[PDB]
Amino acid sequence: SVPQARKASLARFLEKRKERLM
Amino acid sequence: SAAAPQFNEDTLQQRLQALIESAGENWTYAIFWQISHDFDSSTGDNTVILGWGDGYYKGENTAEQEHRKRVIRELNSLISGNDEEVTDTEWFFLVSMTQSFVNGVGLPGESFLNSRVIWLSGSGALTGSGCERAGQGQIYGLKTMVCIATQNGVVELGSSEVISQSSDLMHKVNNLFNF
């Protein structure tokens, strides 16, 4: 479902940001 | 929201990453708009809607910046579930996740309905197009925006660089998103 696909891509988006510190 | 298990599916983000990382030109992001169906409460209606499937963001005021960081923290808290700039292309990518397109409508709906490739190269092309998604992307620094219809949806590509339609990139998208 579209809200799930959103939550998944968003989680991955955040992680990639959280990963530049890390 | 609050507010706004197959092969081809387990393999989607990998294929998006592969498209971007294995490409001749420098692309900023790739989005896959997926086919979904809405059913109307009044009638029997199978309407095709293009929703957010998945994406891969590669990349390359202060008032605006802290608005953006708030949202990211709010989203962070909701999703799970030390601070630097949120760029325009990142923001556009992010906000794209809430967007949808009725079949035939907007750059992706346009692309899917007509099984078409829409290639907008250069700022003039984007703004001159008169489609608001193209105008939005141009506002946020994209100089090139592409929609390629595939069997399950539309692959959107964008870049802050000007890129002419490559025949090689067409083949890439076909290999990765068909079948």
UniProtKB/Swiss-Prot annotation, chain A:
It is found in: Nucleus. Repressor of jasmonate responses. Jasmonoyl-isoleucine (JA-Ile) specifically promotes COI1-TIFY7/JAZ9 interaction. Interacts with and suppresses RHD6 and RSL1 transcription factor activities to negatively regulate jasmonate-stimulated root hair development. This is Protein TIFY 7. Ubiquitinated. Targeted for degradation by the SCF(COI1) E3 ubiquitin ligase-proteasome pathway during jasmonate signaling. Belongs to the TIFY/JAZ family. The jas domain (220-244) is necessary and sufficient for interaction with COI1. Homo- and heterodimer. Interacts with MYC2, MYC3, MYC4, COI1, AFPH2/NINJA, TIFY10A/JAZ1, TIFY10B/JAZ2, TIFY6B/JAZ3, TIFY5A/JAZ8, TIFY9/JAZ10 and TIFY3A/JAZ11. Interacts with RHD6 and RSL1. The chain holds residues 218 to 239 of 267 of the full protein. A motif (Nuclear localization signal) lies at residues 5-12. Changing residue 16 to A: No effect on nuclear localization. Induction: Up-regulated by jasmonate, wounding and herbivory. A motif (Jas) lies at residues 3-22.
Swiss-Prot record, chain B:
It is found in: Nucleus. Constitutively expressed in roots, stems, leaves, flowers, and seedlings. Residues 42-83 are annotated as: JAZ-interaction domain. Induction: Barely up-regulated by jasmonic acid. Disruption phenotype: Minor effect on jasmonic acid response and no effect on glucosinolate biosynthesis. Myc2 and myc3 double mutant has an increased insensitivity to jasmonic acid. Myc2, myc3 and myc4 triple mutant has no jasmonate-related defense response, is devoid of glucosinolates and is extremely susceptible to generalist herbivores. Disulfide bonds: none annotated. Transcription factor involved in tryptophan, jasmonic acid (JA) and other stress-responsive gene regulation. With MYC2 and MYC4, controls additively subsets of JA-dependent responses. Can form complexes with all known glucosinolate-related MYBs to regulate glucosinolate biosynthesis. Binds to the G-box (5'-CACGTG-3') of promoters. Activates multiple TIFY/JAZ promoters. The JAZ-interaction domain (JID) (82-141) is sufficient for interaction with MYB proteins and most of the TIFY/JAZ proteins. Homo- and heterodimer. Interacts with MYB28, MYB29, MYB34, MYB51, MYB76, MYB122, MYC2, MYC4, AFPH2/NINJA and the JAZ repressors TIFY10A/JAZ1, TIFY10B/JAZ2, TIFY6B/JAZ3, TIFY11A/JAZ5, TIFY11B/JAZ6, TIFY5B/JAZ7, TIFY5A/JAZ8, TIFY7/JAZ9, TIFY9/JAZ10, TIFY3A/JAZ11 and TIFY3B/JAZ12. This is Transcription factor MYC3. The chain holds residues 18 to 237 of 592 of the full protein.
